[PDB]
């Protein structure tokens, strides 16, 4: 049985849902996980997966920044699996802060996870700051 894992790099957009790319030091082991429409990791195989995201953001507090790991399962409404908060820095022009989320979830064939935030324009895209991935146990 093949290893199934993904690691994708943050991507900015002039258009709440974070965007991602297969570029830099990314992982996509095979077609059994796919990055769809730059926004979601979609799995072909049911099973347990460890799923993670880290978001660095640069803001000025002048109310928390929340990041959410969301699940869209076929025939189900979207739901939040994990959420983290961080108050805004008061550094000028902006203060960087980071959130990390991770846990083990059951995914269904065709299930998609995605990352939502309070302010996508404040996300840091510098090398390594913001990323999203999963691995099948």
């Amino acid at each position, epitope marked *: 049985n093949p290893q199934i894992a993904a690691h994708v790099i943050s991507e*900015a*957009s002039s258009k709440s849902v974070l965007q991602w790319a*297969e*570029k830099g030091y*990314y992982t*996509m082991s095979n077609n059994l996980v796919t990055l769809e429409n730059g926004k979601q990791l979609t799995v072909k195989r049911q099973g347990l997966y460890y799923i993670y995201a880290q978001v660095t953001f*640069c803001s000025n507090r002048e109310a928390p920044f929340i990041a959410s790991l969301c699940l869209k399962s076929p025939g189900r409404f979207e739901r939040i699996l994990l959420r983290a908060a961080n108050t805004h820095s008061s550094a*000028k*022009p902006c203060g960087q802060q980071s959130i990390h989320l991770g846990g083990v979830f059951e995914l269904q064939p065709g299930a998609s996870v995605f990352v939502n935030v309070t302010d996508p*324009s404040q996300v840091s895209h510098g090398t390594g700051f913001t990323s999203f991935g999963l691995l099948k146990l």
Partner: antibody
Amino acid sequence: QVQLVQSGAEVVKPGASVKLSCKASGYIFTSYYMYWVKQAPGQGLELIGEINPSNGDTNFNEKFKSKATLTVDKSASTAYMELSSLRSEDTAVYYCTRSDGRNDMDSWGQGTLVTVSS
Amino acid sequence: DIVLTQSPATLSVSPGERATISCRASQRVSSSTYSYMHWYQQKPGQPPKLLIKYASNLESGVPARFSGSGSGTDFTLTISSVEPEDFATYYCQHSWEXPPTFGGGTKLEIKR
């Protein structure tokens, strides 16, 4: 019409600083990343760094990290680059450019010539 | 840092001739969906102008005679039929990782 208007040519001595400006109109200033690019008479396009105008967050080419300071004034829709410790090798045309996704750079300023000579 | 090598240094063509120029990256800049390679035109004293984004997408307002192709390490730009306004330097650029870098340029020169 999308426009990036840069400040005028500067002639300066070694050890001086200059502050370059790039005034954006005809689009939502905070929705695009901005890049500064160096073109030495004998070159060659070279990336200096990037700023997010929404928050002033920057990333630099390691070559220019001790040479360039990037700021924006959101109110003035203006990006600025300060170059310090100028040497003759800083002689170049400097461009500002906008980028919708940090991939292609779809609009460029007319460029600002900086001449550093004793 | 990724190195982009453009060939030839100079391409001499007449108006009404097809021109193809190439860009070779030091490593792959293609993945499942996209190639992170872009192409620009630059005339002396003028800023670069974006022509082609993500290897093969014609920028809005750019004439249909411009096209791009390639994947992995190797990209081409083709002018189906050169017009007097096309004589310029052409540059490739990657956006695979930090820092974005540009090729050394191909001068499209008037053949005689």
